[model samples]
Target chain A: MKELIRKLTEAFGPSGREEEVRSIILEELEGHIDGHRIDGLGNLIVWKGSGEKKVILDAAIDEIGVVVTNVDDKGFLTIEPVGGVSPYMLLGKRIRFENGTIGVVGMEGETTEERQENVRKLSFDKLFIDIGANSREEAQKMCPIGSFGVYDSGFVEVSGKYVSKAMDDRIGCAVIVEVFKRIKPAVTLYGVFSVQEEVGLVGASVAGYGVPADEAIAIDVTDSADTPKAIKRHAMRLSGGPALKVKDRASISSKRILENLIEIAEKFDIKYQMEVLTFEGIPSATVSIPTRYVHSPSEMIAPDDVEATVDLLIRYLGA
Target chain B: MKELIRKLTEAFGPSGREEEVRSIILEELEGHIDGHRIDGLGNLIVWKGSGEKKVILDAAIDEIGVVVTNVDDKGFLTIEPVGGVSPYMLLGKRIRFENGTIGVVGMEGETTEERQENVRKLSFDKLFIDIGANSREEAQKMCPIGSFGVYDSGFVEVSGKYVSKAMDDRIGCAVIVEVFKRIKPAVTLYGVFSVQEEVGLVGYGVPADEAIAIDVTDSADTPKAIKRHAMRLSGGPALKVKDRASISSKRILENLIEIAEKFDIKYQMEVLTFEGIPSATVSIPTRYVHSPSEMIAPDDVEATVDLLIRYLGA
Candidate 1:
């Protein structure tokens, strides 16, 4: 489970650039699922035992990144964000282009205090990239204008936790892959690897609209309240098992589905946490893996959470 | 003069990182000057003609830039200032590193208004660079911590005006360089290309203490109308009696004004009121002096150069 999570999270997939991740999921699903096919919008739709009841299990595959807008003569590049980003967290951070070229972010200012002040007042246009190119022509040869780049931090283990750059949805993808590998569902299941969730759930919206489903559930990671500050604010706890969502910024979970999930967890002796979130506005009963630093480059999740969520889903599908 | 200003203004040399500019100055000074030497702190001290009196013509070679303090796992870089910079001017500006890698500045926030507000409240820590590196290992291999960079703007001529980045003292450097090539000084002249001036007058203070400083001030014509005799562009160089950093000695001020009159150099008189210590300020009529798109008229710059040359003879 840990290795699968690492492999999925390590794949490069920012919004509108999910091909690399989609390919990995396709490779893993071959000869395992009853039938699988990619949708027109690049969503991986796989299922087993097609029946009257269609249960869609959705997980997003994209992460956040920036796009190159301009390249100056001295080989410096300008950029803008592709999704939700905190510019404050970007300073001196490493970025990775799609073509594998490496570049470091840099800035221009007069004083340390003033630079800090300028960062608060300035936009992304004020930052630049250094790829070791001596000239504008040289920079253009590497990362071109409009090329997208994601965070460069790779996967790592901390104690009993897994940390990575794209754990938000990639971890969810890993859970689906594990469930498929381990279970023979009693009911029909549509394991959907959705794309562009960070950019307004573009893939899931389309997949959910087209696929015939009596009900659906979106699998993803949610913010943890395990830290001191988070504890003060009553955030989700790490290693507290899978989070069962009652209410989110998006949508209220189906009471029947929520109760059924809880009942199965109790029956299987699986530990779980109840979630009441108000940060986002989506319409699904989300069973999220507890993660800290949700949008940062070094996001953390407990490995045990992934396994327990897989166990809970297997029992729920077979129940 | 335009060609020289264009070349010098476009060179990448931030505070504490003036080697590239120093090399360019050394090349430009070769064969034309009598003797030159680089000091311990990278100050290019050049001398021509010998006399009892030593006159120091001072101009800094460094511009303002940010230094990378940390690189996040997402490959975003955080930075701090090397000198005085306005956050408003940095938005959308390009920067260059020593090795020529290019990256663009990008921001992430909730909304356009919120982002703008965040930019105003955040520090260099809030901004990020997009270099297109795929992973943290990939980024570390390219640009490591402590790598310095500067504004990457190129020189351009627009409507008979010269424009480029680092024009603050590069134009002054051009003025001093031109003065050395054209005239034989009556007094001993130390043409010093000082370093780290943007961070604080680190290079100029020592050279000024050793010789009488006739340093070029960054005072330029402004659209602001608060002060009397507001310096305006194309109004020629301003002979400074006093400014915020230092006040000109009475003798030096009188001598320069006298030379300007005798040489028929177009000039202005400037007395800027800054709260800091007063320093001798010879105002050059420049627009956007500290910005990447700083502008200066060829005529005014030439006149400042000519006036300094005549004053050196006086």
Candidate 2:
């Protein structure tokens, strides 16, 4: 399972252009799940267990990437935003371009605190990922306009925990795959791994609408409370069993689904917590009206508590 | 006036690239109209009358000038429609390329009848306008992509009648300009000479909205009616109109017809013709649209101008 998580997380893919990673997902889960297929927008649906009463579980497969808008004569390139980036988190970080070039993001020069803050709101227009190419024509040959890049950050085991760049949501995708392997429920189960979530939570609505489930349970990773000085209300701590998303940036857990999770957690004595986070999204909760976060990123979620979430889904579906 | 029409009709000015025609128009009507201005789309709106009821009369200054999209090594210019062309009307007609070089419109190897009907639908891919240049480089040096041309059949007055190129709406322009000299209506009148109407009705809609007038009128050629063609109810001759435009509201039609009759304007009944166009824009009533030399009563235009002048004070 660790190897599978490593493989899935290691696969290279970007939002909208998810062919590579989708192939890996299909290969890994082909015979492992009862039934599965991919849709037009590249969401893969894995179904297991069967009956009239059904439930849906979702995880997004796409991750953040950058698009090449222009390449200069000296091989320097301009990028456009494919997804949101945290200013404090992204600065000076060694980012990877899809074409295998790497560069550190920062301004040309800065002396004042105000200048540095101005550089923070600065978008791809103000930044160029140095691919170490020389001459404009030479650089354009390597990375033309419209090429994409994914985070090259690798998964790491740090003192009984894992850290990676795309752990934001790929980690959630990993959780659902694991639960599908372990659970055999009489009620039907649907596992939908979506695309372009990082861009604007684009495909979730149509995917959710296609769900045959009368009820739904969504699994996603949120900020871990393990980091010191992090706000307690926003994240979940290590060794804490999976946290149920009572409400998150974009979705409100349905009353039936929320109570159902609590009942399963109590019956199984799984470590559990209910949460609401500050963020925006277009979650399954919006399959009906009041479609919040029709197009926003920063989909707040807690990672550590999500593990116990899979257990609750398995046990509840099994019942 | 004959030389004015000849020189204006002789020159080639493509849509949006109407520098030559505009220069000629400004020079010709320099002190003729009260005031005029060019819009963002390059439509020149010349004003004539003044009153409380706002009215805009338009004539597109641009014409169906051919564009040289590419030039062959043999000096044959691959041309495309910068504005509308009848295609059939192009063949056998002498064309003057942008560099003032003369040539004829011809298709490759096809017979005359095949050439005529086939020319109707053929685009630049299937046709070329010849402008006798020595070689490809000579042609390239003188004429490049975006170069325009028009039929070289200059304005002719062999008998008493005068026929001129770009006369489709330029005659309308001349009438409006002539009216400004005679009529002083109490309404705000917009003598808007539009652009790209020859290719498609493009800039006409711009002034229609900007002027915020309930009704908009344009001077365009109506199609000539045939003997067997059915006529409208009030018809003397089935004055060809409103076949391409949607049906005008009955009230607006009646009002216009009433004005024509009251002024003793010799006019014929026009019918609602085109099936596709809607009767209005955003629910405002519209009518009296025809196409490709839509026939008109010579007296009806004068009456239409007087019809507008009466409403100038009302």
Candidate 3:
């Protein structure tokens, strides 16, 4: 399980560009899933068994990152945030582009005071990515404009919690893959690895419309409030098991689905979190894994919570 | 209260253009208000008393409406949705612009079959407004491009309920207006009549550490609708636990329920997610929202006022 999470989290996939991540997930589900089809929006839909009821379980495979907007004269890359990347989080961070190139974020300031002032009022224009190229042509040759990159971070087990990048979704991906490997289906299920969820839920917008499913639940991550003096608490905490969201900005969880998932969790005594964190044209529910520093390079989640999330999902599938 | 509801509901006000509604509300509370300030985003914040806690009560004054994008050659006006105004609902419905011109929604398509197909596959683009004009020049002469209007409807009491347009914030406005006229506050309270709320909660130009937006919510008592929600018409007032933009202030939710139970003022819970400004909303269960004819129970409005008064009082 740890190995699966590590591999998926470290994969180079950001928003619209998710082929490599999709390949790895396909590899993981090679023998487990009965059949797979790529939808119009690049969502990978894997189906199992015939229908008593068709249920679509979604997890965004897309991660927030930067798109190289310009290649400057000093080989530095000016970038734009693909999803919810903050300028404050980008300072002094590293990004790994698709072409196996590593870049360190360099800020535009000369002195300590100037840099401090820039940090206080940081924006994307003042930041550039240095990929060790000496000239504009040198940088453009390596990784030109329109190249996307994930925050360059590795997966590590620290004090029972996993610190990694793209845990926002890969955690969800890991859960569904594990569910596919384990579940004895009583109903038809579509495990939809949705695309461009960070940009908007544009993928699942079409994914469910084509399928005959009436229910959907997104398994995603919420930024944990059990951190230092949190401004708003969505009751998210690392190791708080799986989160049964009451509401979030994306979509409200279906009441019926939410009701049943909670019953299954209690029936198995699996722990969970509840949030009214508030999405959309449609109302859907989410079972989120609470992670510390969400959207940052080093998102932290407990292994116990991941396992419990997997357990709860499996129990829900069976129930 | 009926008089206030009628006057407010009939007033020409829509998202981003709420001067007439604000004027009427200010006129209604000529001597009642203690202090008030209109925020930069045009949110009218009215306050009373001083206390250890400052609580903001929000209820947007703006209603869902349309803006004329184009005045066609035949004097027909193409308009865009300012909020959640549905084309299906607006078929043949009248719209009253700020300039006092009344227009009727006219759908595109030359034949009945084509119009029926357009209705099923309804969108804003296939609709236009006809203000009884002769030509493009005649139409633009009155309510021209960028002009806004509200659903032209009047309040009517039928069997124990009021059917009207803009019952959304007018009902919310009535509750606060009634609250201000009667309450001897134990806490500092700000009643914010927000703007552009119908277009997203874009007008909460202000706040408190805690706020509970007062607005109308969809009722579930109607046949087949009960499964979707728990709120019902005449079910006192619905306390928002969660919505699209906010989680209710947990403390405020409990406190209102405490007041409800203590006074036995019937209250319900609702979770029609997606909204903004405050994390909380105290909703009046209304039927057929965002349409010309919105239905509300006076009993619910009274219960909401009774509950808020009891809760806001020391």
Best by lDDT: 3
- Candidate 3 residue lDDT tens string, B1-314: 89999998988777766756766776676566654434445566567755435577778787888899998888999999888888888888988887779999888898889978988899999988989888988987677788988788899998979989999878999888888888887766778887663423423433245677788888877776647557888788998775334344676788888999999899887766442434567899989888888999999999998988897776
Arrange candidates, best TM-score first.
3, 1, 2
Model 2 docking category: incorrect
lDDT of 1 by residue, A154-223 (tens): 9998886789988878988989988888777777888888754222432353224356776677788888
CAPRI tier for the interface of model 1:
incorrect
Give a tens-digit lDDT track for model 1, residues B129-236.
666777666765566567677777879988988888877878888888888888777766678787764423533222222233333444444545456667766778
Tens digit of per-residue lDDT, candidate 2, span B176-221: 5544545565654556666664524633321121121122232223
Query: Second chain TM-score per prediction?
Result: 0.88, 0.69, 0.90
Candidate 2 lDDT for residue A263: 79
**Would you list the C-alpha lDDT of every candidate in the order shown?**
0.72, 0.54, 0.78
TM-score of each model, paired residue for residue: 0.49, 0.46, 0.52
**Candidate 1 vs candidate 3, lDDT winner:** 3
List runs of model 2 lying over 4 Å from the truth.
A103-106, A110-123, A197-199, A206-209, A230-235, A247-253, A277-306, B1-314
